[PDB]
């Protein structure tokens, strides 16, 4: 089965903006694993921003929550990462993650989108 995670949607953008990220995986994935959104900022480690299905409830890190909000779409094996009320702290790299506790040992990452929150 093919496993592939595409990623889109970053960019620059205003504080108080919106940005969109969207992850793309081949049904095999998007189906039965649970999907996760971490960020890296420069000069720190990746960190958790939301997860959605896998039979676990929606989660998502206290920085973000209220603001950030994930979701899914069948039609086109996508989850999307609605992120308003974006600030400074929230400039990183986003990746999307895939993975599975019970039977694979393995996770698998996106390439990374980068999301630039600059006051200009």
């Given at each position: 089965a093919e496993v592939q995670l595409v990623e889109s949607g970053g960019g620059?953008?205003?504080?108080?903006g919106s940005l969109r990220?969207?992850?793309a995986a081949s049904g095999y994935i998007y189906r039965r694993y649970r999907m996760?959104?971490?960020?890296q900022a420069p000069?720190?480690?990746?960190?958790?921003?939301?997860?959605?299905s896998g039979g676990?409830?929606?989660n998502y890190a206290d920085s973000v929550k209220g603001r950030f909000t994930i979701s899914r779409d069948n039609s086109k094996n996508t989850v999307y990462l609605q992120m308003n009320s974006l600030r400074a702290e929230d400039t990183a790299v986003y990746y999307c993650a895939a993975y599975?506790?019970?039977?694979?040992?393995?996770?698998?990452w996106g390439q990374g989108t980068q999301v630039t929150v600059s006051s200009l």
């Amino acid at each position: 089965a093919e496993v592939q995670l595409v990623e889109s949607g970053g960019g620059l953008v205003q504080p108080g903006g919106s940005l969109r990220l969207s992850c793309a995986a081949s049904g095999y994935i998007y189906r039965r694993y649970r999907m996760g959104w971490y960020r890296q900022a420069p000069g720190k480690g990746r960190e958790f921003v939301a997860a959605i299905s896998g039979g676990s409830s929606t989660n998502y890190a206290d920085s973000v929550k209220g603001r950030f909000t994930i979701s899914r779409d069948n039609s086109k094996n996508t989850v999307y990462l609605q992120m308003n009320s974006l600030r400074a702290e929230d400039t990183a790299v986003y990746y999307c993650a895939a993975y599975r506790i019970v039977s694979d040992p393995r996770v698998y990452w996106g390439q990374g989108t980068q999301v630039t929150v600059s006051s200009l």
